[PDB]
Amino acid sequence: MSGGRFDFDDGGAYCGGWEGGKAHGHGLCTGPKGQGEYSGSWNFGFEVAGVYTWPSGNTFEGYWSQGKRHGLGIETKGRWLYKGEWTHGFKGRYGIRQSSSSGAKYEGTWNNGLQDGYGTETYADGGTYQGQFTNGMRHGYGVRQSVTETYMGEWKNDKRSGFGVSERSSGLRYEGEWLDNLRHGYGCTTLPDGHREEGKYQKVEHSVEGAQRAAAIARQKAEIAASRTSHAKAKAEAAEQAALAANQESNIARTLARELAPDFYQPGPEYQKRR
């Protein structure tokens, strides 16, 4: 019903609807010195659906709750793009991060804004990891596919560590213990013709049994990861619809701000202009 322009002493301003002394309806808000811009819908003091543009031209397009990115949304940050769920200002739980320049992506679960839980990481050269992540790193069990070698086994702080099996499409395989992406501990190596090799890099049959067990586990962990990746893909697609809804409210807010304050400079378009 009412609205207008309110100028803050730091150079920013709110221009849009208000009701009961709170931002309401649609509105555009700029930060200190007019730097940074939210444009979208509001409900009694809180953003709902809209676009935040940083001075660099980077953007968040999607849903908000209690003053934070929350729900579905898409973040464009130059080196990469994130689409999917947001929880109280952080990426997650389910979503996809995709490189702007290459094929590299991560699809799966996130915790505290980091790759964490289960997912599929696809690398620049087209190879994959599928399985467990902890705090951004391959940690637990998972399957490392190359571009046709494949590792199935244990991981610790982003490196093969513990029991694991490495088998190339030539038959060259290693079953045993590992340390830092390097054969280390008890474990043999089978040749393509069949020639078995060194024991230490009796108790080797134990390390091979532990290796083949961890490879079996890793294959199950990759299966879980594949299910999580599929859900992350569905939530990234829902976030494409969230971004479009956010831009719809942003454009309504730009129009209103234009009517309410024809002279107020909306910085968002110029930010995005050459990005």
Partner: peptide, 15 residues
């Protein structure tokens, strides 16, 4: 890069 959001008045409290 961090999101600026103003406190009070027109805006609901956050934390």
């Amino acid at each position: 890069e961090r999101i600026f959001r103003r406190t009070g008045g027109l805006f609901g409290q956050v934390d």
